[PDB]
Amino acid sequence: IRITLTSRNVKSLEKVCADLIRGAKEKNLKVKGPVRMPTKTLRITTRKTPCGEGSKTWDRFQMRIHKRLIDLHSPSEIVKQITSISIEPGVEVEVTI
Amino acid sequence: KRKKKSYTTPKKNKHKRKKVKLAVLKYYKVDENGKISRLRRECPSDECGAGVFMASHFDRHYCGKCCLTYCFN
Amino acid sequence: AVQISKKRKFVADGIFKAELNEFLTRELAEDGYSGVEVRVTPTRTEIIILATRTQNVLGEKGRRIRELTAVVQKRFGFPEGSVELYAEKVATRGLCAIAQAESLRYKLLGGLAVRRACYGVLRFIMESGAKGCEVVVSGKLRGQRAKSMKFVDGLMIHSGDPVNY
Amino acid sequence: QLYWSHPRKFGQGSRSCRVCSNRHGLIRKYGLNMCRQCFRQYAKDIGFIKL
Amino acid sequence: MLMPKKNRIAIYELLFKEGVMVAKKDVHMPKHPELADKNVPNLHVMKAMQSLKSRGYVKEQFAWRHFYWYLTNEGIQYLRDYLHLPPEIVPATLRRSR
RNA sequence: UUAAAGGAAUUGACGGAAGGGCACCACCAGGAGUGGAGCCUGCGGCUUAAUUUGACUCAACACGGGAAACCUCACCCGGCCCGGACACGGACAGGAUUGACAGAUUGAUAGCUCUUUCUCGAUUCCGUGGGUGGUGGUGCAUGGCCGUUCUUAGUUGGUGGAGCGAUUUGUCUGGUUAAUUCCGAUAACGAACGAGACUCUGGCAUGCUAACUAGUUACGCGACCCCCGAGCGGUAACUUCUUAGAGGGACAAGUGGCGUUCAGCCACCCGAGAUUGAGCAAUAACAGGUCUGUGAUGCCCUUAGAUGUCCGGGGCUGCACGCGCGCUACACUGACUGGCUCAGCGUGUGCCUACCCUACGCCGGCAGGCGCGGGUAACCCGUUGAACCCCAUUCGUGAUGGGGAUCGGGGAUUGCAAUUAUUCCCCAUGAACGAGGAAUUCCCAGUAAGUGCGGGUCAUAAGCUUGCGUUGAUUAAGUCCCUGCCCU
Ligand SMILES: [Mg+2]
Ligand SMILES: [Mg+2]
Ligand SMILES: [Mg+2]
Ligand SMILES: [Mg+2]
Ligand SMILES: [Mg+2]
Ligand SMILES: [Mg+2]
Ligand SMILES: [Mg+2]
Ligand SMILES: [Mg+2]
Ligand SMILES: [Mg+2]
Ligand SMILES: [Mg+2]
Ligand SMILES: [Mg+2]
Ligand SMILES: [Mg+2]
Ligand SMILES: [Mg+2]
Ligand SMILES: [Mg+2]
Ligand SMILES: [Mg+2]
Ligand SMILES: [Mg+2]
Ligand SMILES: [Mg+2]
Ligand SMILES: [Mg+2]
Ligand SMILES: [Mg+2]
Ligand SMILES: [Mg+2]
Ligand SMILES: [Mg+2]
Ligand SMILES: [Mg+2]
Ligand SMILES: [Mg+2]
Ligand SMILES: [Zn+2]
């Protein structure tokens, strides 16, 4: 049974990961590590101008999608208890049994 | 810009479609002062000819609502 | 029964944020509008309007906030009361530059000329804890040519990364 | 009455933008529909930074 | 020029039930997507709501493709004219508040 | 006849005046080239019923990510629709407002119109006021954005002197740096915006934190050969290799010299690095461009036979010429064939409204078709088995087998339709081009150049552009002579 935590920024990602570690390592659960995924980047290049004057000056917009996975083998009643967390809004939670 | 769309006029005048009829339309006929004689043709049962009659033509027949086409020699 | 990728759901949520925020700043231009914060909970999607004059958001009899909740629900597809709105009061009026420009707009509309309006907003922002402010008003300002009227007071950082926050 | 011909299911005319129904400039396929002139102003709202 | 008669009573009944209407810019010429709630796509909705936005009954807001129609208290005072036909029922906007 | 003319003096602005500096969009010593030929694609001019349009030295000319079969399309040719909101008012049809079958005309089975006559139900049609739309004009009315000045280092206030005062010193003789960055002398002091500092990528490392959506050592299942415990591949622990969190690590610090105590330059070691590349980026302008990005907009024009909006075509491509950015060659350091061998960014499905990425097996010579499977993704393509390169054969200085322009025939793919343009494959036709005058563009180390891949355009789709990888130099670390700019 795995849980995917995918956040917008790495600071809130590490804060909710530290909260999950602090709320999980006291129970009788063999907690697997927050497996680091490679950072995804959506690169968009923009002309910067509505009309064609000047040099070829381009905006380069990027995001940094950070993804983490955790593994917790347990009955399904424990997963719903762990899931109830007062969480940062920039964090997305998925479960997979 | 300088080229102005002017009326070259090979086609002088045309008018819109104006629906004109007579004053009143009597589809029925009085027999024996109370019995109605049907003159025009009805439409067959395809949920169209419950109150819709056909129009006279040289060789065709036409329904009003659902536009049913009929032809007979 | 449908799903989209992580690389597209993020930009769809970001376009949702910008769409909702700028629709609310285009229809809630009357009161003091600051911004929105959307919490994603699959039982109840929470939308918090941070605003200055929250009395207009609360409405007369709890009218306008429920009406705009219906406005969100009848397009964005969340039946059964999934979308729930909450208004927050911004007591620091001189903190939000969006609210300051939104209040400067209604003073520039009905009379209340540009010199008096600019010094009146600069005195308020400088009194409300801010270390510096700059108001740039440009356009047709008493003449055919576009005279740029700029006013700067206090301290202002222009270059580098921490300008954005 | 012939109201809708020329079905416009492909190409440049089928791409109608999300911002102002602009169709002259191109519209990207990233899960995104912008006009490339408003994308600069609205990237800081939808979540793109310059770096 | 008229639609079937169910169209007008359906769109004003939906406005009676909710008070919020939304349509998009796409007037029938490239593509024909129908309304997400009813049968008539965009143009009959605009023809029904232009008589309300022109007389000052229902306010108009535009967002990026979409016409949102907004309810006024004087809007309800002139929806009394529509309320001539059903019994007097206030929709779920002004009556109660949870 | 006029309410100014005039005199010192301050700050801008200007100069075709002087001095000092900076820049590889300036040069020296060089490299690649362009300008020469062919082709691709814009511009001017021609031609045309239309060949839409703006932009014209850097700061226009593969720019509007502008790669058009209709779409895009704003230009011509012909033809439908009102979405004419809303008020008063004309007929109000004793309730007749819009929709069409067959024939003619027209691409049309468009009731566009005509012959014909059924249907729809008080929302109509017309007029009088007003309203909407416009990729119509006006960027010299404008907002916003971008470019340029300027990627150069330049601007301002508080106290204090100098002057009656606007103002000036601060904000500078010299040295140094990429820098108004400091030391210094000092009528100046503490200081601000900017440059740095800020953020990201790249470079290091740990028995720190940890991973069956990423690997390693042993080990068993298990294929092969010598047969001599060995060797290469397929299917219980730890993060060294793949990825990412924090912290550390580099500061001119250690030494010697050059320097006024100095600010600072030069040579070496330790080190992975003696400092890499970007983003943001001061006051202030250009009367630079965008109303053709917007439901951002002022003014003017049209609004029912329409500059509104639909349908079918043509056009933007049209060539006696000139110019710019580019692609390919002019061969032997090379072309042909066969074998061998290595990547990294990033993208990919049932999407806020119509849609891919592709493994396998078969058929076909090929471009391609058919059936099935996986992937909403470190899972599948994919251990991206790329090009260049390495080895061997053929050619032998011939416009040759280099170059593949032009042109003929055939076959498949997407599209509803590619013909006065698709695209690809097969055969064939086989031009100029023998390293390019006058001039001109870019560049100081994983850099130029060779070479391929991904995205943007898309449905079929690059020679454009943005990023990524592979191979990978010769020259400088200097100056004010050419050009441009800054300061007194
Ligand atoms: Mg102006
Ligand atoms: Mg002016
Ligand atoms: Mg300005
Ligand atoms: Mg265009
Ligand atoms: Mg004088
Ligand atoms: Mg030059
Ligand atoms: Mg060219
Ligand atoms: Mg020409
Ligand atoms: Mg040109
Ligand atoms: Mg241009
Ligand atoms: Mg025109
Ligand atoms: Mg136009
Ligand atoms: Mg104008
Ligand atoms: Mg004095
Ligand atoms: Mg001075
Ligand atoms: Mg590794
Ligand atoms: Mg400036
Ligand atoms: Mg508007
Ligand atoms: Mg060329
Ligand atoms: Mg080429
Ligand atoms: Mg698509
Ligand atoms: Mg040919
Ligand atoms: Mg496409
Ligand atoms: Zn748009």
Annotated binding site of D for Zn(2+): 17, 20, 35, 38
**How far apart are alpha carbons A62 and D44 in whole angstroms?**
11
Domain encompassing residue E65: 1-98
**How far apart are alpha carbons C87 and C49 in whole angstroms?**
5
Per DSSP, the three-state class of D4 is: coil
**How far apart are alpha carbons C28 and C25 in whole angstroms?**
5
Instruction: Give the nucleotide at minimum CA-to-C1' distance from A65.
Output: F244
DSSP class per residue in A67-84: EEEEE----HHHHHHHH-
Instruction: Show Cβ contacts of residue E78 under 8 Å, excluding neighbours closer than 6 positions.
Output: E55, E57
Apex B14 CA angle, B8 and B18, nearest 5: 160
**How far apart are alpha carbons B27 and B52 in whole angstroms?**
11
Instruction: Give chain E's domain count.
Output: 1
Question: Alpha helix (H) ranges present in chain D?
Answer: 38-46
**How far apart are alpha carbons E45 and E41 in whole angstroms?**
7
**How far apart are alpha carbons A22 and A16 in whole angstroms?**
10
C110 touching E, CB under 8 A?
A: no
Per DSSP, the three-state class of B24 is: coil
Query: Are C46 and C69 a contacting pair, CB within 8 Å?
Result: no
Determine whether the interchain pair C17/D46 forms a contact, defined as Cβ–Cβ distance below 8 Å.
yes
Residue D10 phi/psi, 5-degree rounding, is -160, 175
C2 touching D, CB under 8 A?
A: no
Q: List, in sequence order, every residue forming a beta bridge with C132; answer none if it has no partner.
A: C154
Query: Are E72 and E57 a contacting pair, CB within 8 Å?
Result: yes
**CB contacts, 8 Å: C66 with chain E:** 92-93, 97
Instruction: Give the nucleotide at minimum CA-to-C1' distance from C77.
Output: F352
**N-to-C CA span, chain C:** 40
Instruction: Give the nucleotide at minimum CA-to-C1' distance from C5.
Output: F376
Task: Output C78-81 pairs: Cβ under 8 A, ≥24 positions apart.
Answer: C78/C45
**How far apart are alpha carbons A95 and A78 in whole angstroms?**
12
β-strand C83-89 against C45-51: which pairing, if any?
parallel
Alpha carbon of E48: minimum distance to chain D alpha carbons (Å): 20
* Short-list C40, C3, C36, CA closest to C19: C36
* Short-list E4, E46, E55, E1, CA closest to E21: E46
Structure tokens at D14: 């089928």
Determine whether the interchain pair C11/D42 forms a contact, defined as Cβ–Cβ distance below 8 Å.
no
Query: Are C101 and C68 a contacting pair, CB within 8 Å?
Result: no
Radius of gyration of chain B (CA): 22
Residue type, D17: C
**CB contacts, 8 Å: D50 with chain A:** 59-61
- Alpha carbon C7 to its chain centroid, in Å, reads 28
- Alpha carbon C51 to its chain centroid, in Å, reads 7
Per DSSP, the three-state class of E68 is: strand
Q: Tell me, in angstroms, the distance from the centre of ligand 4 to residue D29's CA.
A: 16
Q: Which of C6, C11, C38 has the CB atom closest to A6's CB atom?
A: C6
Q: Helix axis angle, C64-76 relative to C6-27, nearest 10°? A: 140
Determine whether the interchain pair A61/D49 forms a contact, defined as Cβ–Cβ distance below 8 Å.
yes
**How far apart are alpha carbons C139 and C137 in whole angstroms?**
7
Q: What is the resolution of this structure in A?
A: 3.6
DSSP class per residue in A1-54: -EEEEEESSHHHHHHHHHHHHHHHTTSS--PPP-EEPPPB---EEE---SS--S
CATH number at residue E92: 1.10.10.10
Apex A50 CA angle, C142 and C19, nearest 5: 90
- What Å distances lie between residue C53 and A59, C102, C109, CA to CA? 37, 12, 19
Q: Tell me, in angstroms, the distance from the centre of ligand 19 to residue A54's CA.
A: 21
Query: What is the DSSP-derived secondary structure letter of residue C84?
Result: E
- What Å distances lie between residue C1 and C8, C40, C101, CA to CA? 17, 19, 44
Residue type, C76: F
E71 touching C, CB under 8 A?
A: yes
Residue D23 phi/psi, 5-degree rounding, is -135, -5
Strand blocks (E) in C3-146: 33-39, 45-51, 83-89, 132-137
Instruction: Show Cβ contacts of residue B27 under 8 Å, excluding neighbours closer than 6 positions.
Output: B39, B40, B53
**How far apart are alpha carbons E44 and E7 in whole angstroms?**
8
Annotated binding site of D: 17, 20, 35, 38
β-strand A66-71 against A91-96: which pairing, if any?
unpaired
Q: Which nucleotides of F are covered by protein (CB under 7 A)?
A: 54-55, 58-61, 63-66, 70-73, 75-81, 83, 85-87, 93-102, 108, 110-114, 116-125, 135, 141-148, 192-200, 209-211, 213, 243-246, 278-285, 287-290, 292-296, 305-307, 309-312, 345-355, 376-378, 415-416, 455-459, 465-467
Apex A47 CA angle, A44 and A51, nearest 5: 150
**How far apart are alpha carbons E54 and E42 in whole angstroms?**
18
Task: Output D21-28 pairs: Cβ under 8 A, ≥24 positions apart.
Answer: D21/E25, D21/E65, D28/A44
